[PDB]
Amino acid sequence: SLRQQVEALQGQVQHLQAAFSQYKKVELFPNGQSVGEKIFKTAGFVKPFTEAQLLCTQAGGQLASPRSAAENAALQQLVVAKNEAAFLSMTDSKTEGKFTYPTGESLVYSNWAPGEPNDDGGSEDCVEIFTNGKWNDRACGEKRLVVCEF
Amino acid sequence: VASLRQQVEALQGQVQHLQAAFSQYKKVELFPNGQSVGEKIFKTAGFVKPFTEAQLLCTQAGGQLASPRSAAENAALQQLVVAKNEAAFLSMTDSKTEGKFTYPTGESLVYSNWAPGEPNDDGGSEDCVEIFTNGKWNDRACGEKRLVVCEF
Amino acid sequence: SLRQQVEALQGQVQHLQAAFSQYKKVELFPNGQSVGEKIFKTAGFVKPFTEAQLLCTQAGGQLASPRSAAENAALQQLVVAKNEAAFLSMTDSKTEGKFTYPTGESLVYSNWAPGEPNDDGGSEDCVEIFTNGKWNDRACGEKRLVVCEF
Numbered sequence: 001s002l003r004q005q006v007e008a009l010q011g012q013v014q015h016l017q018a019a020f021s022q023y024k025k026v027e028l029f030p031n032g033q034s035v036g037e038k039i040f041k042t043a044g045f046v047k048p049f050t051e052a053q054l055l056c057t058q059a060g061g062q063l064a065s066p067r068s069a070a071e072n073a074a075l076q077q078l079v080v081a082k083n084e085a086a087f088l089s090m091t092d093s094k095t096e097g098k099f100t101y102p103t104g105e106s107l108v109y110s111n112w113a114p115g116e117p118n119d120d121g122g123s124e125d126c127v128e129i130f131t132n133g134k135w136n137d138r139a140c141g142e143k144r145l146v147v148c149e150f
Numbered sequence: 151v152a153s154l155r156q157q158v159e160a161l162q163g164q165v166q167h168l169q170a171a172f173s174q175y176k177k178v179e180l181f182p183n184g185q186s187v188g189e190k191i192f193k194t195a196g197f198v199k200p201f202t203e204a205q206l207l208c209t210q211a212g213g214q215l216a217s218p219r220s221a222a223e224n225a226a227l228q229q230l231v232v233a234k235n236e237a238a239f240l241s242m243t244d245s246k247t248e249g250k251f252t253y254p255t256g257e258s259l260v261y262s263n264w265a266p267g268e269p270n271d272d273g274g275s276e277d278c279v280e281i282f283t284n285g286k287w288n289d290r291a292c293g294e295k296r297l298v299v300c301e302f
Numbered sequence: 303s304l305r306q307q308v309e310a311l312q313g314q315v316q317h318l319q320a321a322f323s324q325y326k327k328v329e330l331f332p333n334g335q336s337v338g339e340k341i342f343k344t345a346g347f348v349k350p351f352t353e354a355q356l357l358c359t360q361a362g363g364q365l366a367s368p369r370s371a372a373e374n375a376a377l378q379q380l381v382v383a384k385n386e387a388a389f390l391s392m393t394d395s396k397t398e399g400k401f402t403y404p405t406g407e408s409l410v411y412s413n414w415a416p417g418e419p420n421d422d423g424g425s426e427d428c429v430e431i432f433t434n435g436k437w438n439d440r441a442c443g444e445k446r447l448v449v450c451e452f
């Protein structure tokens with residue numbers, strides 16, 4: 001009967017997989033985007049960098065950190081849909097000119113708009129992504145769309 | 151051997167936890183922008199868009215525009231429309247053949263809840279369908295903006 | 303061969319646990335809070351008590367019912383985030399001066415602001431929670447943030 005149980009439990013698990021897959025699609029509409037094993041989700045409102053960063057970390061994730069063209073495109077979809085530029089997780093607060101992820105690791109991908117980053121004004125240590133997907137270093141005190149990744 | 155037995159017993163415990171946890175999250179997830187009816191789930195985006203844009207949003211999300219195929223589904227959909235107090239677009243149109251409304255697949259309707267006198271192709275240019283807060287349907291110009299509600 | 307059958311099932315279950323865990327974080331961000339086996343979720347808008355109560359009940363849950371300091375703090379987080387006081391499920395509509403849960407039992411926990419409840423104007427049978435986490439009885443006809451528990 002052990003084989004029978006495995007047969008039965010697998011039926012329940014595959015039914016669970018089906019239900020879960022459906023609820024996942026529902027979950028991401030319309031404020032989320034999945035790319036690979038990563039999920040981006042916007043809070044739907046704007047906040048300064050520090051507050052946005054805290055919201056994501058307290059939620060068990062971190063600010064959007066596109067590490068490839070594919071991830072950047074998925075994130076771009078949310079920014080376009082909300083029509084609001086969003087903050088990324090990277091900053092060059094430690095070493096001006098050198099942007100890093102929250103862990104301190106150097107960028108493995110970038111999509112800077114022409115002429116960026118320019119540390120305009122002498123104090124732009126955060127990064128925002130435009131509706132066109134391009135990046136721009138921006139003053140961390142400005143308010144931008146909050147998008148976290150999980 | 152008994153090793154497999156122990157593993158099956160372990161799997162049963164993990165599965166029961168997932169089922170209970172998932173049962174709770176289903177309710178949490180659908181509050182307040184979703185409605186479950188049978189094996190279908192309606193989810194509103196909370197904003198309005200013209201038909202073509204609304205349709206694209208749903209298809210890109212892995213679903214399609216709300217397609218109520220029974221009174222029960224139509225009532226579930228109506229709940230979201232009433233909550234947002236915004237009439238919504240359905241997926242059906244008679245863009246191909248005037249007077250013949252079909253689902254995106256091309257199949258003819260299996261259920262309808264037209265308000266009296268509808269569809270009337272008003273102005274000779276209404277190929278889309280909207281559902282009112284009272285649950286009744288009305289054919290409407292696809293260029294108009296209505297609440298976006300997808301089904302999954 | 304049963305071993306290879308169980309082995310396949312184990313793979314599915316382990317993947318589901320990981321996928322479900324990631325999804326839980328996505329769902330709770332930014333309108334939910336999990337504390338113990340309870341989950342609070344705000345609709346993000348305000349409604350009078352009766353309408354708020356119906357929304358929660360029809361959703362398969364009930365209005366926020368903090369039963370401990372831990373739960374109250376979790377609920378408070380949502381109130382603070384939305385900067386809108388929220389209705390709790392308890393009322394003393396049946397017997398003035400005696401607040402009870404929807405079931406009818408008396409409170410097992412409370413966090414009343416100084417001087418409350420005071421049945422102001424002789425007509426406050428509902429309860430709101432402030433951004434400071436304290437409670438105040440309020441007219442059920444007033445509109446407050448809708449927060450349900452599941």
Ligand SMILES: OC[C@H](O)[C@H]1O[C@H](O)[C@@H](O)[C@@H](O)[C@@H]1O
Pocket residue numbers: 115116118120124136137138
């Ligand atoms: O964050 C500020 C922006 O980088 C802005 O800076 C300068 O004013 C110019 O280089 C603009 O073209 C650029 O868009």
Ligand SMILES: OC[C@H](O)[C@H]1O[C@H](O)[C@@H](O)[C@@H](O)[C@@H]1O
Pocket residue numbers: 268270272276288289290
């Ligand atoms: O979509 C437009 C509606 O059909 C509208 O059209 C006309 O104006 C009349 O027939 C109305 O009674 C009807 O409600």
Ligand SMILES: OC[C@H](O)[C@H]1O[C@H](O)[C@@H](O)[C@@H](O)[C@@H]1O
Pocket residue numbers: 418420422426438439440
């Ligand atoms: O809900 C109404 C509040 O209790 C309010 O009532 C009265 O106006 C006074 O007792 C205030 O100090 C108190 O804050």
Ligand SMILES: [Ca+2]
Pocket residue numbers: 092093096122123124125
């Ligand atoms: Ca600097």
Ligand SMILES: [Ca+2]
Pocket residue numbers: 092096097119123124125126137
């Ligand atoms: Ca800088």
Ligand SMILES: [Ca+2]
Pocket residue numbers: 116117118119120124136137138
């Ligand atoms: Ca710049």
Ligand SMILES: [Ca+2]
Pocket residue numbers: 244245248274275276277
């Ligand atoms: Ca036509």
Ligand SMILES: [Ca+2]
Pocket residue numbers: 244248249271275276277278289
């Ligand atoms: Ca028509």
Ligand SMILES: [Ca+2]
Pocket residue numbers: 268269270271272276288289290
């Ligand atoms: Ca019409």
Ligand SMILES: [Ca+2]
Pocket residue numbers: 394395398424425426427
């Ligand atoms: Ca009273």
Ligand SMILES: [Ca+2]
Pocket residue numbers: 394398399421425426427428439
């Ligand atoms: Ca009272």
Ligand SMILES: [Ca+2]
Pocket residue numbers: 418419420421422426438439440
């Ligand atoms: Ca009071």
